[PDB]
Amino acid sequence: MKPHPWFFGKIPRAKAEEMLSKQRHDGAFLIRESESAPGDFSLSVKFGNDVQHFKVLRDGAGKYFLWVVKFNSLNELVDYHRSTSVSRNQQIFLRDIEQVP
């Protein structure tokens, strides 16, 4: 087992945009710990010449979700959205960013 290449911890929202702007393929993403909402996570995803940000929402039990389907972990939320679009305006599927060697 290896650590997940998508967890960047506490990095500025702007830093996520800077990084993902350099990614070549739509869907490139990262999970970060929100600075405006301590204790909450945010998902930043590249699409075209833009970087979209999503709030990782929680239900009453602590499960995570973006829209309707929820999961017992960020890990499962992320994997589910690799084959189900994170967007309702475009078909954008999460894919690991091109990691630096």
Ligand X SMILES: CNC(=O)C[C@@H](Cc1ccc(OP(=O)(O)O)cc1)C(=O)N[C@H](C(=O)N[C@@H](CC(N)=O)C(N)=O)C(C)C
Of 78 and 92, which CB lies nearer to a second copy in the complex structure? 78
Q: Is residue 36 within the footprint of ligand X (CB under 6 A)?
A: yes
Size of the site for ligand X (CB under 6 A): 14
Of 4 and 91, which CB lies nearer to a second copy in the complex structure? 4
Question: 57 - beta bridge partners?
Answer: 65
Q: Where are the alpha helices (DSSP H) in 22-92?
A: 74-80
The residue from 30, 51, 86, 92 that contacts a second copy (CB under 8 A) is: 30
Q: Is residue 57 within the footprint of ligand X (CB under 6 A)?
A: yes
Task: Give the three-state DSSP class for 13.
Answer: helix
Task: Give the three-state DSSP class for 22.
Answer: coil
Binding mask 65-84 for a second copy (x = CB under 8 A): -------xxxxx-x------
How many CB atoms lie under 10 A from the CB of residue 10?
10
Q: CA 31 → CA 24, 61, 77, distances in Å?
A: 18, 21, 11
- Interface ranges with ligand X (CB under 6 A): 13, 34-37, 42, 52-55, 57, 66-67, 87
